[PDB]
Amino acid sequence: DTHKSEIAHRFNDLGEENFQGLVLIAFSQYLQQCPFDEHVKLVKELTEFAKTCVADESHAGCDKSLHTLFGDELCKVATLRETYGDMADCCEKQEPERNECFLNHKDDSPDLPKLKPEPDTLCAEFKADEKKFWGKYLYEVARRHPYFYAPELLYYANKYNGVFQECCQAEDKGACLLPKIDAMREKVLASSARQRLRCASIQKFGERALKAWSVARLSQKFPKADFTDVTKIVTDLTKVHKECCHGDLLECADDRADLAKYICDHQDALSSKLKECCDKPVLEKSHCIAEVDKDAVPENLPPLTADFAEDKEVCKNYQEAKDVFLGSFLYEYSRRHPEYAVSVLLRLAKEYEATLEDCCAKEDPHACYATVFDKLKHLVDEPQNLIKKNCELFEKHGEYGFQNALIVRYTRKAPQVSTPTLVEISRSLGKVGTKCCAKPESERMPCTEDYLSLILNRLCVLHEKTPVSEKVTKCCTESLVNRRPCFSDLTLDETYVPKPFDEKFFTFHADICTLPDTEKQIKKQTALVELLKHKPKATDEQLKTVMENFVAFVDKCCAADDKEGCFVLEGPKLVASTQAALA
Numbered sequence: 196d197t198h199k200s201e202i203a204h205r206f207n208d209l210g211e212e213n214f215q216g217l218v219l220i221a222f223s224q225y226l227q228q229c230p231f232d233e234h235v236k237l238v239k240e241l242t243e244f245a246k247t248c249v250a251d252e253s254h255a256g257c258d259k260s261l262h263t264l265f266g267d268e269l270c271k272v273a274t275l276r277e278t279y280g281d282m283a284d285c286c287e288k289q290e291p292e293r294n295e296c297f298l299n300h301k302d303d304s305p306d307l308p309k310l311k312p313e314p315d316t317l318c319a320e321f322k323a324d325e326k327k328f329w330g331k332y333l334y335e336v337a338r339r340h341p342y343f344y345a346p347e348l349l350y351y352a353n354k355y356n357g358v359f360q361e362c363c364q365a366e367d368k369g370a371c372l373l374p375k376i377d378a379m380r381e382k383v384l385a386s387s388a389r390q391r392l393r394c395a396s397i398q399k400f401g402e403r404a405l406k407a408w409s410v411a412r413l414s415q416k417f418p419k420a421d422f423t424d425v426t427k428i429v430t431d432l433t434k435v436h437k438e439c440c441h442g443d444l445l446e447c448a449d450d451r452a453d454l455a456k457y458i459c460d461h462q463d464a465l466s467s468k469l470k471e472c473c474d475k476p477v478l479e480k481s482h483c484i485a486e487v488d489k490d491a492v493p494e495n496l497p498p499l500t501a502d503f504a505e506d507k508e509v510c511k512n513y514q515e516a517k518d519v520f521l522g523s524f525l526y527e528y529s530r531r532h533p534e535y536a537v538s539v540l541l542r543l544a545k546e547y548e549a550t551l552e553d554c555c556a557k558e559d560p561h562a563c564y565a566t567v568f569d570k571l572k573h574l575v576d577e578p579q580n581l582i583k584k585n586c587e588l589f590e591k592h593g594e595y596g597f598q599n600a601l602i603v604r605y606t607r608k609a610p611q612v613s614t615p616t617l618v619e620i621s622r623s624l625g626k627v628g629t630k631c632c633a634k635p636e637s638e639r640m641p642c643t644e645d646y647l648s649l650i651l652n653r654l655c656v657l658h659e660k661t662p663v664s665e666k667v668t669k670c671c672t673e674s675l676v677n678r679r680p681c682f683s684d685l686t687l688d689e690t691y692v693p694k695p696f697d698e699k700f701f702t703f704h705a706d707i708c709t710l711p712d713t714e715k716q717i718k719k720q721t722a723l724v725e726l727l728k729h730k731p732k733a734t735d736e737q738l739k740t741v742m743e744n745f746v747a748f749v750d751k752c753c754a755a756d757d758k759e760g761c762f763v764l765e766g767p768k769l770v771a772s773t774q775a776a777l778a
């Protein structure tokens with residue numbers, strides 16, 4: 196797969212809208228800190244050429260590689276912000292270390308303003324210049340989530356655009372889109388969290404880890420497929436994900452559309468559930484597929500024991516072709532159990548392997564593994580006690596109150612982890628309870644255990660930037676499969692030494708009165724954590740006390756005429772009230 200020109204080939208195979216979309220998405224992801232203007236300049240230029248090259252392919256440079264042009268028209272034209280302690284230098288170096296540099300400056304927590312949707316303003320920018328508006332949703336998003344799966348972002352930018360198109364005619368604009376962009380915002384964050392797991396697997400964990408996940412995912416959705424065609428899909432689908440993580444975004448997309456086609460040529464041996472998706476346009480297509488409902492468990496399927504427990508050849512197979520035998524086990528197990536979460540299924544493929552390892556060198560392997568499946572059914576007991584026990588706590592306290600309980604756990608579990616992180620993480624776990632505890636339990640486990648896999652991974656990439664807690668590095672590093680369990684076990688690090696007391700961590704101002712509900716809670720929960728870090732041993736009761744006083748006090752002072760003065764006047768009292776009172 197070489198061409199007269201890679202760029203003209205991508206431009207033809209993608210068109211202008213998506214071409215530009217992805218190109219801007221690349222830059223926004225490299226240079227997360229340059230404003231949107233500069234970006235669109237550069238997109239037009241490589242958009243310039245692509246036409247030049249559809250026009251005449253033999254033209255000077257039409258032949259260079261994609262890293263090349265992206266580099267030259269990013270680097271030598273405007274050597275943007277050397278200030279980046281990272282970026283300045285790669286510039287002058289060539290193929291392909293220069294691009295290799297570029298990628299590795301990606302920042303996973305770039306701390307730009309969190310934008311809160313204001314309808315009247317938003318509707319307006321949509322009326323002013325509908326295409327900029329769409330470009331800025333890309334730049335804004337992509338720049339916050341430098342590993343967002345690019346094609347899937349385009350499809351999201353067009354959805355957002357369909358909401359403004361539907362809603363701005365209305366008289367209460369708000370009651371129209373706010374909701375619609377709310378539940379959409381979630382979809383996009385889960386999308387981001389899910390492709391960072393992919394990327395982080397391929398890198399800390401080997402690409403084989405990626406294929407295993409995918410192999411479970413697809414064997415539930417296409418339960419009626421052969422193992423060979425599942426492996427064929429998981430094969431190319433991984434190349435897709437591979438490129439996207441690798442920044443070959445354009446390659447990534449063209450390649451995702453082929454796989455979508457291929458999937459539609461064979462929709463027959465795949466599922467009688469893909470025909471909607473298989474005549475939709477390009478991107479709707481790929482989004483639809485990935486998300487299609489799990490086909491029906493085929494009829495009259497052999498017991499699993501037939502090949503994984505009674506067959507005599509088990510140990511031979513395991514020894515002659517380990518991966519093969521095991522992928523097959525994974526397929527055969529997943530297509531029979533859609534109610535299971537991909538995360539759990541892998542712990543089970545892993546456990547079955549542990550058992551083989553063990554018995555295949557005992558003297559009578561079959562007596563040892565013959566009962567394996569009865570064992571396996573029970574490993575699911577834990578992740579379901581866990582979810583049950585955490586849901587009750589949630590329905591009890593409701594969301595905020597759940598979050599606040601998770602804050603005490605996780606702070607006690609990893610006190611060395613920075614406060615924004617304990618706050619961020621602690622808030623997403625909380626939410627899973629909102630997202631899942633009402634689900635039928637045939638969708639629950641999947642729900643719950645899937646998200647936890649995404650939230651923990653977030654935990655992991657924040658932490659491994661600035662490692663501080665050893666237990667966490669362990670949980671993050673040992674087995675991708677056992678992470679959730681690992682972290683759940685964490686007990687209070689008895690190694691920890693208290694933060695020294697500090698009035699600013701409990702100083703409060705009258706902004707609390709006025710901020711949105713999210714900013715208000717993050718404020719309070721940020722205090723909780725610091726309270727913990729400074730007294731880790733502290734009894735839950737002592738905390739309730741302490742939170743209770745903070746609350747009453749935010750009230751007495753938010754009802755005041757002069758709100759700030761209040762905060763200046765009783766503030767101390769509440770400080771003092773905290774230190775000696777619950778010392």
Ligand code: PRO
Pocket residue numbers: 196197198
């Ligand atoms: O025009 C070409 O040569 C490309 C290479 C793969 C098939 N078509």
Ligand code: PRO
Pocket residue numbers: 497498501
């Ligand atoms: O149904 C059958 O024929 C196979 C034989 C082993 C287990 N099930």
Ligand code: PRO
Pocket residue numbers: 770771772773774775776
């Ligand atoms: O705030 C209090 O009550 C304690 C007493 C001495 C130092 N601070």
